[PDB]
């Protein structure tokens, strides 16, 4: 949005630059091309950082529009997102799934794990492909974190970022939790937040 109260600050841009979020792959799909700045002299694509913040605020404006927070479902089958989705679901009251998704969880009405959500958020479209393709049987809207070579086939909001691993995946979930809590009125739009980004990251060498 145009508003100064929604503008991206210097201190967020430095946190993007320090985590590698702007660095894509060596390949580009034709659906992702509008999110790209340029290709480097070494064959790597640069993701446009202002495009990310608009698509992330549009995603937060979808997540705030659900009146019961337990109706939102959150997923990661790769390890680099598992701590991050568990912390996101603690900060705001969504339902997490981590590890293997069981086929038929959304469509086998009798099943012990059966559930019926209103919104679905996924960490990587190529890896999390079962809950994406299974959402096509039940009228379920979708948000996803997309790299330059991600296949867009059932996602309705794609957020441009490096999703390969490490600090970049944890930072995106932390920043999405910050803005949903801000615009619902639970924390300040000006005072810094008490939760450090480093709480969401995956398994750097411990000692």
């Amino acid at each position: 949005g145009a508003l100064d109260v929604l503008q991206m600050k210097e201190e967020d841009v430095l946190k993007f630059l320090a985590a590698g979020t702007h660095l894509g792959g060596t390949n580009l799909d034709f659906q992702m091309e509008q999110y790209i700045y340029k290709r480097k002299s070494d064959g790597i694509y640069i993701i446009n950082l202002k495009r990310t913040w608009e698509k992330l605020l549009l995603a937060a404006r979808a997540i705030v529009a659900i009146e019961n927070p337990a109706d939102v479902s959150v997923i990661s089958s790769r390890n680099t997102g598992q701590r991050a989705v568990l912390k996101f679901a603690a900060a705001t009251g969504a339902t997490p799934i981590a590890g293997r998704f069981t086929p038929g969880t959304f469509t086998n009405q009798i099943q012990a794990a059966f559930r019926e959500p209103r919104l679905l958020v996924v960490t990587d479209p190529r890896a999390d492909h079962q809950p994406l393709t299974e959402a096509s049987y039940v009228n379920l809207p979708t948000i996803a974190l997309c790299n330059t070579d991600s296949p867009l086939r059932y996602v309705d909001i794609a957020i441009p970022c490096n999703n390969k691993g490490a600090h970049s995946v944890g930072l995106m979930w932390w920043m999405l939790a910050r803005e949903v809590l801000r615009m619902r009125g639970t924390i300040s739009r000006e005072h810094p937040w008490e939760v450090m980004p480093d709480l969401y990251f995956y398994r750097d060498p411990e000692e």
Binding site: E67, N68, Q109, E116, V138
Partner: protein, 226 residues
């Protein structure tokens, strides 16, 4: 025994709402294009007005080391003679279970049927709104508008589904292997089904949106429910 209540308790969000609150018709379930998975929802809205028809019972079999092994397949059609019809199929080791299973699938498959006029717009509509068609296997089926009081010009299989749908007047045509009753029934139900999704000049004005039933009743599903 005596037919008291609690023969049903819901297992879906839609079933929890239909049993309790002001979801007043199937048309506000069709408007949001939701899947129906509890058979008791359609007994709640249409009920004893629905009438039932066995089209064919068919034997099928597989070869084994010992003998040929046989199953019975039943085709069933259902409707209320005023704008609703459904078709269903099941295959079982015994005929009575095949018919009873086919009736449940024939209730879950029900769709709304569109009706219109051949001439000037006097009274209430009585024929298909425009020329339509459906396919299954090699079989092709086609329906054409007709002047008031002709009846249905068709073979037996398509005539029974058009009567249960509540259409008075219709001209019809077919092509390729109609002798396969299952593909002939599904090609007919495909033609009937397409009548409410053909864009026509009376549907050109802009759409106005509303909240869905899961959004209007978002607190009823939380405050006293599981």
């Amino acid at each position: 025994g005596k037919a008291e209540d609690k023969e049903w308790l819901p297992v879906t969000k839609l079933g929890r709402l239909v049993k309790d609150v002001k979801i007043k018709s199937l048309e506000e379930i069709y408007l949001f294009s939701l899947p129906i998975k509890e058979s008791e929802i359609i007994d709640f809205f249409l009920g004893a007005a629905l009438k039932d028809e066995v089209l064919k019972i068919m034997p099928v079999q597989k070869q084994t080391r010992a003998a040929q092994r046989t199953r019975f397949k039943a085709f069933v059609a259902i409707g209320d003679y005023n704008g609703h019809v459904g078709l269903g199929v099941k295959c079982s080791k015994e005929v009575a279970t095949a018919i009873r299973g086919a009736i449940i699938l024939a209730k879950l498959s029900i769709v709304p049927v569109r009706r219109g006029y051949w001439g000037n717009k006097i009274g209430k509509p009585h024929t298909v709104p425009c020329k339509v068609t459906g396919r299954c296997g090699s079989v092709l089926v086609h329906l054409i508008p007709a002047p008031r009081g002709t009846g249905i010009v068709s073979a037996p299989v398509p005539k029974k589904l058009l009567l249960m749908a509540g259409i008075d007047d219709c001209y019809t045509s077919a092509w390729s292997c109609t002798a396969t009753l299952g593909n002939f029934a599904k090609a007919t139900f495909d033609a009937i089904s397409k009548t409410y999704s053909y864009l026509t000049p009376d549907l050109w004005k802009e759409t106005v949106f509303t909240k869905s039933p899961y959004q209007e009743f978002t607190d009823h599903l939380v405050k006293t429910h599981t």
